[PDB]
Amino acid sequence: MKEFYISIETVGNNIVERYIDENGKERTREVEYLPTMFRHCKEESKYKDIYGKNCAPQKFPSMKDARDWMKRMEDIGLEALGMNDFKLAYISDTYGSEIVYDRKFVRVANCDIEVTGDKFPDPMKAEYEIDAITHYDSIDDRFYVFDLLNSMYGSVSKWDAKLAAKLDCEGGDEVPQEILDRVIYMPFDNERDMLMEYINLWEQKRPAIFTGWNIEGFAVPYIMNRVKMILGERSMKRFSPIGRVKSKLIQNMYGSKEIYSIDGVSILDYLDLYKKFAFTNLPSFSLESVAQHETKKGKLPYDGPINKLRETNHQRYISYNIIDVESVQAIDKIRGFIDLVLSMSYYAKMPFSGVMSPIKTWDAIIFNSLKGEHKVIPQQGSHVKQSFPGAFVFEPKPIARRYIMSFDLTSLYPSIIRQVNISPETIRGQFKVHPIHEYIAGTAPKPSDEYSCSPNGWMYDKHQEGIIPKEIAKVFFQRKDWKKKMFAEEMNAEAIKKIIMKGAGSCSTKPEVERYVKFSDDFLNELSNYTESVLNSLIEECEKAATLANTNQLNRKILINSLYGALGNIHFRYYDLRNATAITIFGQVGIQWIARKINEYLNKVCGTNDEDFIAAGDTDSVYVCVDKVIEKVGLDRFKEQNDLVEFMNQFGKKKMEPMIDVAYRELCDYMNNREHLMHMDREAISCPPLGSKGVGGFWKAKKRYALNVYDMEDKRFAEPHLKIMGMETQQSSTPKAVQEALEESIRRILQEGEESVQEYYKNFEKEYRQLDYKVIAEVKTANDIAKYDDKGWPGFKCPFHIRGVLTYRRAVSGLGVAPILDGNKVMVLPLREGNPFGDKCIAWPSGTELPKEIRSDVLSWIDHSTLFQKSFVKPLAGMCESAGMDYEEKASLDFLF
Template structure:
């Protein structure tokens, strides 16, 4: 017997004549290997008081029970449970539905065996399997049968995953034109390949070069028809054998269409490493599809960027590659991309190949720039989530928590088991004191909610144990008490915290980001009704403690003689006076942070007999700072401010929640705001600048900055009442498209760019009326200016009226 260690690529459980069989694909230093585990069973739990009735109901339905076992486990309500085991998944699911129909509660009935097998062994992504025998050792991917499995340290076992980017081009009807494949290294070579229907006679040159994409006729694989292209692509994937396939909307569009075209031509889409077609799943609550390919992972660039908390005005490949890389898709007319693709397919296939390959290359460069594959692998190592999992905060928490809970003698609760009727508040936001300030310090609690969890031992099982014995427990809020020694979540966060500190020392940005997202998600998980551990006493004991911490910190700072002008969730904004130098402000910020940290250590030890894990940091010194009022009122805003900071010797503007960082304002408003605020902060005259921008706007000199951009979140037909401007623009544009016999662009979500005209909102490219410059001046320029001008004793109308009197 020997062992095999590797990174888990895919996992699956299937019913066979021998019972449930688990299949895992591992990437090892020697390549990809298939591991099979036999004799596993599916299991859920019922309260022991219900077990006899449950067994009778199951047997009456003709469902086969493999085993019944009364365990030394109990529910959070202290009820003992019995485990029901099944040899087949179909029996497991039938039994679950049967018991639910008869109002018998099943616990942990939503874990698939392939996931539970790993979870109960504390396996996340790197695993060591003890091999019993080999089925086919001489195959390209040997097939091993294993019985035991254990977790291994990710630092001990490191593998690299091969990656290829895939993109296809097609007609509006879904007929394939070409499929591009790009990789910096696959099988020891760079890949720049395009499968193209047709022949080389339809080209304008023998070579094209565009944005570092060199493509020659030799790199195009000519296919006589669509059927030939599909067979060629399938063969290529099996020969070049990538671990990971990436793309842009690659599952919902590219693979979905490839599957449909294979079905049309009666072709088996055999792209798995076991020479089997992929398995498709559909989300019950949406139209989203998921693809499972044995031994290969498909990662969508849009999904993984969102998971890593990236945010863009638009997640189109053109926009993201432009913002991140400064590169663009190879298309001359973005608004008529489909027409250009069709023209190139008809008249210049090499140009289409270059366009296709450029899309593949851009996705590859985005992944490399953002370290998205590394991020996905590290996230899998930390949480047990599969590489292609979108979101998954609840699953990540459960993967880490459940095996510890079982060893403490509990089964997990079900959705809805937590206390009802309570609502825990969100993060604390102080009333702001509006104004223009000099020298504002921002003091920030480092990872506040995880720190509260660590300090006060907030934990689902810890609350159950704390409520059983309040005498030595830590009091929370809303009647919650937390055990001082029986808990898991604080220890999980401590471990992640240490890992993040190490990642920062090692300059491992992808790992640091992955850990930060996971740690910060744990409060959200406990506060989410979609989590089985949800209880408002848990989330309330975090957020209400945060409120108390900020209010008390504010009092302590003001006792020192400084003015707190704002506070938000984990940050305190302190005005320390106009006379201090930058050096003095930085020293004071560190002094205040140290003072507050010491105060909390003393206070928590005296009040709760606990060690404080809270850490207030001096984060920012604003040389100039502006806190606006709510528009049309004297009350200060929340989550909206601007300031001037010194960063590496350069003064920079910082905006939060204002027009310059919002996606629903024009570039005119953003540019105007940045320049105006810069002048105000520098105490420079603003009248001439404002008058100049107004004049340029009215003269049509800034038309390129007047575009609004807004997402269409539903189908156009679903907007009935209070139709917003961008929907009106989209409808008018598609009416024009319909009359002209062109494809409808805006019916099913997407993004629309539009102008405000004298005839109302009109989409870019469909404008047939003069732009309404008065409206732009009123809504964009005046709105921006009058937020800050009253604080320097003037206003927009006064400045513009002076200009108008000159004409």
């Protein structure tokens, strides 16, 4: 196979690189790199810069020589062209051509750690002890488990595999058997031996990419702080193959935590990878909920705080962590995220960790393309931070819109990038600036005829294609090609399964198999001339090829989606404030333009005037509300929801292409570009169920609403699915039972009608009173109690939770219960005025129950009324007031005339 690397780093005047040799074995080499820099030249040279000026190369003998040359030509006020970074230059020059790789060869390690502690174990200080370490090695495909037997928290027994494999009722933990087939378990009596064994295990099998769920937040820091605090820095630095473990301190978002960097292994936090490369939103991003979402496999419920688990049934503890690491692997097996990171790294010819930063990725790819085109990139200009106006958010009228067709165009910012061709050399000057409303209404004349136009007052070329548009075109063509390859792989795989269940009894031999291309019929016959084992190998190969196609396709997708955020950042090598402002305000101008055109055309077609049809909207989405066409055609014509959906789909199909084309060709000739790529679709629809009196879709606030979608992007649903955001259905401040109740109420108001919501209100209101008092008690933190107490009675400015704690202490005076301690958590149950305890609330310690003697007296005297309203009534009020709806009725309007 081709020579492909694992990880490159810089050590002094040398480039060190861990790679895979020609025979599939891991090796390490050290090369004294000779950087080749560039500078401006008056003489004729074949190397021409971005603008077109001739430039001359220059070789250098040392790393420091090149750096000092850059500094010295910087301080004399002269510009030096090329790349300041050198690892990218080395990797680009060494390989040059596109590289191939085998995912099996690269060692992908997974880690997870469990630390028993009195208080939350703090990764930065790492004061507690490690007793659970599960390291998953890929090529060895092994779950190495390190357990600490004799800790300072009391010695415990030894883990048993067969016991854990059993069902939980006999005392097991239900770990799947194939997992225990690979669990290499080792106990340790003392911490030093276990940590040293982990160190030497890292040494023997050095990971190439070292991941885990929330790893740089809790795992990496804790392990390294503990090895520093136990063994010393001289062993802490043994993690890296080059002996360099430098600690970065910032995490400037709140300045809370610290990240780590082991020079030689590419740390890649799986939590960040999921957060950035999933396009999904969840109420909580903790491993358990997302694992349930992804693999539909939670773990057996447990009891008590985690801190005491090690001392109660440590067995389960260790088994718990063993399913912890697998869950992550499961997610990988569903998403192929590490295959994606390998694909991007080897497509951009760049180090692995750069995947975290879109700017580095884009710089690498654009430099590689330009170097392939014999050009030179400019020096990274230094600019100050000048924030530009944000997103043009439409104004939503809090009104219920029954028939609302929503749509947003594809790659808004990337498409605009070809509308204005904004590369640094493409600027051509400025023109006379009109008010923005003039361009919105089109009253301004043509800014320029032979030169392109942008609403930011600036002007760009038309015949000279920019380098950034060239990269956009290349990546977009690659994405289209790989989507075609996906279709090819899909029907090839279905042909293979057709061959499989047709039947094939013959010889066994693997033929000349191809990838990412369509399979011929004669090839299908040849595969039918092979055994069912060979057929299984063939479907495995087809599935692997399809997964690689997915990695490539979503690679292109995220590159395109990240270019916009790359261009607007200061440190990007081709930042232009004019370009960023043009991009943003052109997006605003385009969405306003299409909103106005929608209003005009819908008024003309309906025959009315001055009517507004556009609802709320973002910088790319315009949820126009169109119900006039439905009533205009005649609601009686439709007998089923499917017929109405199909009719409005045909209306959208006949309305989008011609209207959008005419509403964008004039803007295209205004802007004077080569061609208008800018276009929307009919992605989303919504409609209240036929024959019902539900509102269908309302609008509570900006980006806070609900709809009953029938068809997302031609994915029809037999029953309508509710799409909800903004409200507390997804907000975890309220309990989960009320979350279910709110989502059900939302469904009822959208679809069923008024009386349904009234009945559900009354039903839940009856059902809430007898619900268990544990879940309907508010979680609060009990602190600084002694300050707010007055001889065991409430004092000045006594907090509500502290008030409840004081009432509890008064009530449990003489009950023989443990007192509430400062810093503890308490569930609070408010009380009505006049209780024998003489106060409006009570609070009891976390994880415990109310005392039996006073439990009945409390329960008979609790005030659930104001809690119910705060946890359930609040939302309905907003939607019903914003949907022309009532949430409880006490007037007739019927009994009289």
